[PDB]
Amino acid sequence: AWQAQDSLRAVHLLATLRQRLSRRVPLQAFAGLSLAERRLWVAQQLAPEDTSYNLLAHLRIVGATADAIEQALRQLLERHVALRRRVETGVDGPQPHALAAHAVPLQRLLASDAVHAERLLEDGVRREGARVFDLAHEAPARLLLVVTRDSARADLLLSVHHYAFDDVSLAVFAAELKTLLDGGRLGVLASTPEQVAARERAALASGRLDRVAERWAERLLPLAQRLALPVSAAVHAACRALAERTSVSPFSAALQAFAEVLGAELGVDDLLVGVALAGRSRLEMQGLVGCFVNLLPLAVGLRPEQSVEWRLRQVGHDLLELLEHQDVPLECVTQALRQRGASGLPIRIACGAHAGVRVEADFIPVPGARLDLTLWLEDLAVWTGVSAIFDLHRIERLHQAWERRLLANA
C-alpha cells in the first residue's frame, strides 16, 4: 500500500490498510441526489441561464482509431450512470432517472489537418460554454470527437454539467478510456452515485455527521479574473522545509501564508477560509464518476504574538480534521451554526490543490467566480478572483505578498 501511493495519499493509505487489516487509524495520528450533487443542481435552478456550472474537458488522444474511441466512449457512458441521467424536481428532493447510453449526444467530425482540428475545437469550446443544459429532459453530458486526417491524433471535447462531474471524475474517465483503448478490461464498479446518496441519508439520520458539525460550530461562531503564476523554486523549498519542521503537509504551510496575507490585506484578526475537498471518504468512491466535492470552512487566527510553528500546527491540525470528516456536508455546518443564533457562515475565500495509447485530459477553466478569491496549487499558483474586488493587478500583488510571507515564515 505504501509503494502504491500528500495527506490525501495518507487517507488512501489508511483506507487500504483498513480494507486489508481492519480497524481505523485516524490520520490525525499519522499525518436521490447527494448533497454534493444537489447543491450544484439547486444553484443552477436559481439561475437557469447561468452557464458557470458547465465543465469543459479537452482530451487529447494519440494512437487510437475513431471507431475504437467512439466504442470506448459508449462503454464509459454505460458504465458511469452520472453522465446519462435526467433530474426531475421532487416534493422532498430532486429525483434522478437513468437514460440510455445512446441518448448522450456524440458528434464525430473529420478535420483536414491540425489547424482545422484546432478551429473545430475552439468552435466547440465557445458553443458548449454558452450552452444551457436541459437537466430535466436530457443527459447532462455531450461529446465532440474531432479526428485529424492522416494523423494518429484525435481530440475529444467533453461538456458535462458540474452536478454530474468533478476533477477526480476526469482523471478516472481519462484513465479508464486509456485502459479500453489499450485493450484492457474494467473491473465491476463497487458503488454508484445513488448508493453514495443513500449512505449519506443514513449517516445524516444517525446524527453522526451533525454531531461533528456541532463541534465545529463552536470555533466558527465568532466568524458567522484568473491568473496562473509559477511558484519560485526557493518558495517551494521553503514551503517543504517549513512543513517538515512542523510535521504538517506542505499545503498547510501554503494555506497559512494565504490566510495571513489576505488577513492583513483585509485587516482582520481572524479569517474564514474554505478548503475544497474531493469528498470521496470511502475506498469504493475512488473510481466513481460524479460530483463529490465538498467545501468545508477553516477558521485561521492571525495572532502575530504566537510563533510561526504554533500557528502552522493549528492550521495543519484543523486541515486533517476536515480531511477526516470530509463526508460531513457543508449544509450540516450551516445547520449547526443557525441552531446557535447565526444567519449563516460567510465563505468568501477558498483554497485547494490538485506505453500504449496516450490520453491527456485537462479542464478548460470556467469563467466567472462564485467566491471572491481562490488559490489553487498545482504540482503553479492559480488565483481566481471576482474582477470587481480582486482584479489582475491586485492578484499579482497578493501573490508576491504570499511568496514573501512564505519565505519569512521559513
Residue numbers in the entry: 746 to 750, 767 to 792, 823 to 1015, 1034 to 1163, 1173 to 1197, 1203 to 1233
What does the paper say about this structure?
To obtain AmbB T–C with l-Ala, apo full-length AmbB, which activates l-Ala, was used to trans-aminoacylate l-Ala onto the Ppant of the T domain of AmbB T–C. MS analysis showed a mass shift (+71.04) of the alkylated Ppant arm as compared to holo AmbB T–C, which corresponds to the molecular weight of l-Ala. In the structure of holo AmbB T–C tethered with Ppant-l-Ala, chains B and D exhibit relatively well-defined electron density for Ppant-l-Ala while chains A and C show fragmented density for Ppant-l-Ala. The interactions of Ppant moiety with C domain are essentially identical to those observed in the structure of holo AmbB T–C tethered with Ppant. The thiol moiety of Ppant is covalently attached to the carboxyl group of l-Ala via a thioester bond. The positioning of the Ppant places l-Ala in close vicinity to the active site, with the reactive carbonyl group facing the donor side of the C domain. l-Ala is surrounded by two residues namely Phe1181 and Leu846. In holo AmbB T–C with l-Ala (chain B), the side chain of l-Ala is oriented towards the hydrophobic residues Leu846 and Phe1181 while the free amino group is in close proximity to His953, poised for condensation reaction. Ppant-l-Ala of AmbB follows the same trajectory in the donor side as Ppant-fVal, placing the substrate l-Ala and fVal, at similar distances to the catalytic His953 and His908, respectively. Superimposition of holo AmbB T-C with L-Ala and the T-C bidomain of LgrA, gave an RMSD value of 2.60 Å for 345 Cα, suggesting that AmbB T-C and T-C bidomain of LgrA adopt similar conformations. In addition, the delivery of the substrate l-Ala, did not cause any discernible conformation change in the C domain.
